[PDB]
Amino acid sequence: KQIVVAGALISRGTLLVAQRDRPAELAGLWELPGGKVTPGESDADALARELREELGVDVAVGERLGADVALNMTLRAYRVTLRSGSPHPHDHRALRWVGADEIDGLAWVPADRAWVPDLVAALS
């Protein structure tokens, strides 16, 4: 199982979500950003690397958020917190900061939908 990590970045009381740009089936839909773990990397090292490339930030990787999602690979989310930088959509169509009440109305990528109740809880 190839592991894919995702980050739930909470800052000043809101969650960062990222709007995919590709492929066509996901372009326009929202996700927790991240990517594949390369063999030899820890989950923390992979997620920090992905978020530095995608968002231009240095984050600290914390506790898991929610459960694994079986894509077929397996997707796991972690809480992350900002160390330096301000996020910009280098690899996404857009970013947004959302509160608890916005989470269930967002047009999530299908895999991430499972985390809705966990994200609401984390913001509540």
PDB file of C-alpha atoms in Angstrom:
ATOM      1  CA  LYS A   1       0.000   0.000   0.000  1.00  0.00           C
ATOM      2  CA  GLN A   2       1.401   3.354  -1.125  1.00  0.00           C
ATOM      3  CA  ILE A   3       0.673   5.935   1.573  1.00  0.00           C
ATOM      4  CA  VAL A   4      -0.611   9.390   0.750  1.00  0.00           C
ATOM      5  CA  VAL A   5      -0.467  11.997   3.479  1.00  0.00           C
ATOM      6  CA  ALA A   6      -2.681  15.077   3.846  1.00  0.00           C
ATOM      7  CA  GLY A   7      -2.490  18.061   6.135  1.00  0.00           C
ATOM      8  CA  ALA A   8      -5.180  19.760   8.182  1.00  0.00           C
ATOM      9  CA  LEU A   9      -3.626  23.160   8.773  1.00  0.00           C
ATOM     10  CA  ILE A  10      -5.544  25.101  11.408  1.00  0.00           C
ATOM     11  CA  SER A  11      -4.413  28.720  11.958  1.00  0.00           C
ATOM     12  CA  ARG A  12      -6.000  31.567  13.869  1.00  0.00           C
ATOM     13  CA  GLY A  13      -9.060  29.259  14.254  1.00  0.00           C
ATOM     14  CA  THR A  14      -9.781  28.290  10.591  1.00  0.00           C
ATOM     15  CA  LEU A  15      -8.829  25.309   8.380  1.00  0.00           C
ATOM     16  CA  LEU A  16      -6.930  25.671   5.126  1.00  0.00           C
ATOM     17  CA  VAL A  17      -8.536  23.894   2.161  1.00  0.00           C
ATOM     18  CA  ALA A  18      -7.120  23.660  -1.298  1.00  0.00           C
ATOM     19  CA  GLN A  19      -9.032  23.540  -4.596  1.00  0.00           C
ATOM     20  CA  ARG A  20      -7.628  21.006  -7.024  1.00  0.00           C
ATOM     21  CA  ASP A  21      -6.703  22.001 -10.574  1.00  0.00           C
ATOM     22  CA  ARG A  22      -6.321  18.497 -12.008  1.00  0.00           C
ATOM     23  CA  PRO A  23      -7.242  15.968 -13.247  1.00  0.00           C
ATOM     24  CA  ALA A  24     -10.564  16.988 -14.841  1.00  0.00           C
ATOM     25  CA  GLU A  25     -12.626  14.820 -12.491  1.00  0.00           C
ATOM     26  CA  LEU A  26     -11.249  16.585  -9.387  1.00  0.00           C
ATOM     27  CA  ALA A  27     -10.511  20.065 -10.782  1.00  0.00           C
ATOM     28  CA  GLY A  28     -12.718  22.487  -8.895  1.00  0.00           C
ATOM     29  CA  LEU A  29     -13.161  20.212  -5.867  1.00  0.00           C
ATOM     30  CA  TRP A  30     -11.581  20.769  -2.479  1.00  0.00           C
ATOM     31  CA  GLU A  31      -9.072  18.776  -0.453  1.00  0.00           C
ATOM     32  CA  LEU A  32      -6.607  18.688   2.353  1.00  0.00           C
ATOM     33  CA  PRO A  33      -3.316  19.135   0.512  1.00  0.00           C
ATOM     34  CA  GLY A  34      -0.497  16.631   0.522  1.00  0.00           C
ATOM     35  CA  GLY A  35       0.898  13.753  -1.524  1.00  0.00           C
ATOM     36  CA  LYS A  36       2.622  10.482  -1.736  1.00  0.00           C
ATOM     37  CA  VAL A  37       5.229   9.258   0.731  1.00  0.00           C
ATOM     38  CA  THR A  38       8.348   8.129  -1.006  1.00  0.00           C
ATOM     39  CA  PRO A  39      10.018   4.909   0.347  1.00  0.00           C
ATOM     40  CA  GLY A  40      12.569   5.983   3.001  1.00  0.00           C
ATOM     41  CA  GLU A  41      10.580   9.025   4.103  1.00  0.00           C
ATOM     42  CA  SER A  42       8.603   9.318   7.296  1.00  0.00           C
ATOM     43  CA  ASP A  43       5.043  10.533   7.050  1.00  0.00           C
ATOM     44  CA  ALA A  44       6.180  13.787   8.692  1.00  0.00           C
ATOM     45  CA  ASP A  45       8.956  14.303   6.184  1.00  0.00           C
ATOM     46  CA  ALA A  46       6.702  13.598   3.221  1.00  0.00           C
ATOM     47  CA  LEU A  47       3.914  15.858   4.398  1.00  0.00           C
ATOM     48  CA  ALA A  48       6.210  18.742   5.252  1.00  0.00           C
ATOM     49  CA  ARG A  49       7.878  18.378   1.859  1.00  0.00           C
ATOM     50  CA  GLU A  50       4.593  18.330   0.000  1.00  0.00           C
ATOM     51  CA  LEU A  51       3.233  21.364   1.820  1.00  0.00           C
ATOM     52  CA  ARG A  52       6.429  23.340   1.306  1.00  0.00           C
ATOM     53  CA  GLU A  53       6.203  22.622  -2.465  1.00  0.00           C
ATOM     54  CA  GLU A  54       2.424  23.135  -2.794  1.00  0.00           C
ATOM     55  CA  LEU A  55       1.888  26.004  -0.416  1.00  0.00           C
ATOM     56  CA  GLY A  56       5.211  27.668   0.246  1.00  0.00           C
ATOM     57  CA  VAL A  57       5.109  27.049   4.012  1.00  0.00           C
ATOM     58  CA  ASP A  58       7.110  25.303   6.661  1.00  0.00           C
ATOM     59  CA  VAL A  59       4.795  23.269   8.933  1.00  0.00           C
ATOM     60  CA  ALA A  60       5.140  21.083  12.001  1.00  0.00           C
ATOM     61  CA  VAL A  61       3.345  17.740  11.656  1.00  0.00           C
ATOM     62  CA  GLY A  62       1.276  16.701  14.671  1.00  0.00           C
ATOM     63  CA  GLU A  63      -1.337  14.140  15.607  1.00  0.00           C
ATOM     64  CA  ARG A  64      -3.480  12.235  13.119  1.00  0.00           C
ATOM     65  CA  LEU A  65      -6.814  13.751  12.130  1.00  0.00           C
ATOM     66  CA  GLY A  66      -9.429  11.097  11.507  1.00  0.00           C
ATOM     67  CA  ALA A  67      -8.939   7.625  10.132  1.00  0.00           C
ATOM     68  CA  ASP A  68      -7.138   6.151   7.123  1.00  0.00           C
ATOM     69  CA  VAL A  69      -9.048   6.227   3.852  1.00  0.00           C
ATOM     70  CA  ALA A  70      -8.607   3.355   1.458  1.00  0.00           C
ATOM     71  CA  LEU A  71      -8.231   4.891  -1.996  1.00  0.00           C
ATOM     72  CA  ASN A  72      -7.683   1.453  -3.575  1.00  0.00           C
ATOM     73  CA  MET A  73      -3.211   3.252  -1.786  1.00  0.00           C
ATOM     74  CA  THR A  74      -4.161   4.640   1.618  1.00  0.00           C
ATOM     75  CA  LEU A  75      -4.750   8.273   2.592  1.00  0.00           C
ATOM     76  CA  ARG A  76      -3.965   9.581   6.056  1.00  0.00           C
ATOM     77  CA  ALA A  77      -4.481  13.100   7.400  1.00  0.00           C
ATOM     78  CA  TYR A  78      -2.445  14.835  10.104  1.00  0.00           C
ATOM     79  CA  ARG A  79      -2.924  18.054  11.956  1.00  0.00           C
ATOM     80  CA  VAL A  80      -0.208  20.499  10.931  1.00  0.00           C
ATOM     81  CA  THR A  81       0.653  23.943  12.253  1.00  0.00           C
ATOM     82  CA  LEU A  82       2.481  26.840  10.653  1.00  0.00           C
ATOM     83  CA  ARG A  83       6.122  27.528  11.434  1.00  0.00           C
ATOM     84  CA  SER A  84       6.906  30.068   8.683  1.00  0.00           C
ATOM     85  CA  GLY A  85       5.475  31.411   5.467  1.00  0.00           C
ATOM     86  CA  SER A  86       2.006  32.232   4.233  1.00  0.00           C
ATOM     87  CA  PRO A  87       0.194  29.685   2.053  1.00  0.00           C
ATOM     88  CA  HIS A  88      -0.284  30.356  -1.631  1.00  0.00           C
ATOM     89  CA  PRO A  89      -1.813  28.091  -4.323  1.00  0.00           C
ATOM     90  CA  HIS A  90       1.278  27.063  -6.244  1.00  0.00           C
ATOM     91  CA  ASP A  91      -0.302  23.777  -7.244  1.00  0.00           C
ATOM     92  CA  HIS A  92      -3.998  24.371  -6.746  1.00  0.00           C
ATOM     93  CA  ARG A  93      -6.654  26.559  -8.298  1.00  0.00           C
ATOM     94  CA  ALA A  94      -7.335  28.369  -5.032  1.00  0.00           C
ATOM     95  CA  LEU A  95      -7.010  28.194  -1.261  1.00  0.00           C
ATOM     96  CA  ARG A  96      -9.576  29.123   1.388  1.00  0.00           C
ATOM     97  CA  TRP A  97      -9.671  29.412   5.168  1.00  0.00           C
ATOM     98  CA  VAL A  98     -12.900  27.888   6.442  1.00  0.00           C
ATOM     99  CA  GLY A  99     -14.686  27.570   9.754  1.00  0.00           C
ATOM    100  CA  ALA A 100     -16.640  24.687  11.220  1.00  0.00           C
ATOM    101  CA  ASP A 101     -19.913  25.787   9.697  1.00  0.00           C
ATOM    102  CA  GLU A 102     -18.436  25.873   6.157  1.00  0.00           C
ATOM    103  CA  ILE A 103     -16.922  22.411   6.180  1.00  0.00           C
ATOM    104  CA  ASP A 104     -20.017  20.322   5.278  1.00  0.00           C
ATOM    105  CA  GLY A 105     -21.032  22.613   2.440  1.00  0.00           C
ATOM    106  CA  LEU A 106     -17.710  22.521   0.644  1.00  0.00           C
ATOM    107  CA  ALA A 107     -17.454  20.529  -2.614  1.00  0.00           C
ATOM    108  CA  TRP A 108     -14.908  18.015  -1.315  1.00  0.00           C
ATOM    109  CA  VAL A 109     -12.956  15.555  -3.401  1.00  0.00           C
ATOM    110  CA  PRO A 110     -14.677  12.220  -2.747  1.00  0.00           C
ATOM    111  CA  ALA A 111     -11.877  10.691  -0.708  1.00  0.00           C
ATOM    112  CA  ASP A 112     -11.757  13.548   1.745  1.00  0.00           C
ATOM    113  CA  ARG A 113     -15.476  13.611   2.452  1.00  0.00           C
ATOM    114  CA  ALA A 114     -14.960  11.007   5.155  1.00  0.00           C
ATOM    115  CA  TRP A 115     -13.114  13.534   7.235  1.00  0.00           C
ATOM    116  CA  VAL A 116     -15.967  16.052   7.391  1.00  0.00           C
ATOM    117  CA  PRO A 117     -17.137  15.079  10.917  1.00  0.00           C
ATOM    118  CA  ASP A 118     -13.525  15.036  12.168  1.00  0.00           C
ATOM    119  CA  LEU A 119     -12.793  18.464  10.751  1.00  0.00           C
ATOM    120  CA  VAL A 120     -15.951  19.929  12.150  1.00  0.00           C
ATOM    121  CA  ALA A 121     -15.007  18.535  15.575  1.00  0.00           C
ATOM    122  CA  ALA A 122     -11.494  19.912  15.328  1.00  0.00           C
ATOM    123  CA  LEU A 123     -12.911  23.382  14.569  1.00  0.00           C
ATOM    124  CA  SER A 124     -15.550  23.260  17.270  1.00  0.00           C
TER     125      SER A 124
END
